[PDB]
Amino acid sequence: PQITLWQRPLVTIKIGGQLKEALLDTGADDTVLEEMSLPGRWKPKMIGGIGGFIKVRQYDQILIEICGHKAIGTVLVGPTPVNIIGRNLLTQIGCTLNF
Amino acid sequence: PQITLWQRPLVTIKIGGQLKEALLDTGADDTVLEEMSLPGRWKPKMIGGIGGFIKVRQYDQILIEICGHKAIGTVLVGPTPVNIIGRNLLTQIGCTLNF
Numbered sequence: 001p002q003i004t005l006w007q008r009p010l011v012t013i014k015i016g017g018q019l020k021e022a023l024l025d026t027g028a029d030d031t032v033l034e035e036m037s038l039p040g041r042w043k044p045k046m047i048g049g050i051g052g053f054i055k056v057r058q059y060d061q062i063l064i065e066i067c068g069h070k071a072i073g074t075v076l077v078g079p080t081p082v083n084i085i086g087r088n089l090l091t092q093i094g095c096t097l098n099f
Numbered sequence: 100p101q102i103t104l105w106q107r108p109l110v111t112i113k114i115g116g117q118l119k120e121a122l123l124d125t126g127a128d129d130t131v132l133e134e135m136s137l138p139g140r141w142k143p144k145m146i147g148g149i150g151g152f153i154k155v156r157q158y159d160q161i162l163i164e165i166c167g168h169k170a171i172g173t174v175l176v177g178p179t180p181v182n183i184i185g186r187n188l189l190t191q192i193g194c195t196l197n198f
């Protein structure tokens with residue numbers, strides 16, 4: 001699909017048997033979601049940007065479905081104000097910027 | 100052009116007759132650049148990010164070239180981690196997300 005940028009590029013994602021709305025963010029290196037539970041082991045990580053840093057839990061090899069496109073990758077979980085889909089997963093769904 | 104996301108989508112922009120490196124960021128509503136000087140009066144603006152908020156200076160009708168594409172719009176200046184080209188200008192240069 002082709003998504004314009006007149007409005008925030010929000011899409012529904014399916015992760016851990018849960019449905020959530022997330023922002024397709026080309027400026028984000030990693031995918032970070034609001035507090036939720038995920039399987040497997042995790043590593044603490046600190047991610048920052050505008051406003052400073054937040055502490056998150058890093059889970060690797062996590063399955064996620066974005067706009068029907070399945071992908072696997074690292075998901076950070078923490079106090080983010082919005083669910084973000086970063087480049088680490090945008091690449092897997094073949095997402096590109098065009099102009 | 101078509102830009103893949105295996106790496107940060109950093110491009111060259113020109114503003115105030117100077118070249119700067121910036122991030123094409125679909126997750127950003129606005130364009131925010133690191134401290135610099137711009138003409139005219141400015142208005143107050145707060146941008147909410149991953150770690151909280153920051154105060155910035157808002158300048159309107161500013162000429163800016165993005166990857167060779169000329170644009171004229173609102174440019175915010177403040178303590179941002181990197182120069183960010185947000186949706187307000189991505190829409191002006193006809194940029195979209197595709198997959």
Ligand SMILES: COc1cc(CN2C(=O)N(Cc3ccc(O)c(OC)c3)N(C(=O)CCc3ccc(O)cc3)C[C@@H](O)[C@H]2Cc2ccccc2)ccc1O
Nearest residue numbers: 025027028029030048049050126127128129148149180185
């Ligand atoms: C609302 O308009 C703007 C918001 C931002 C702040 N911002 C953010 O807070 N970040 C932080 C961030 C989040 C996730 C990541 O995986 C990530 O990895 C780099 C960074 N970004 C950025 O700041 C990009 C800059 C950057 C580059 C390298 C680095 O080491 C740290 C930061 C990405 C932006 O898209 C964006 C994502 C976002 C949106 C709403 C609420 C919270 C965050 C900004 C402008 C708006 O108009």
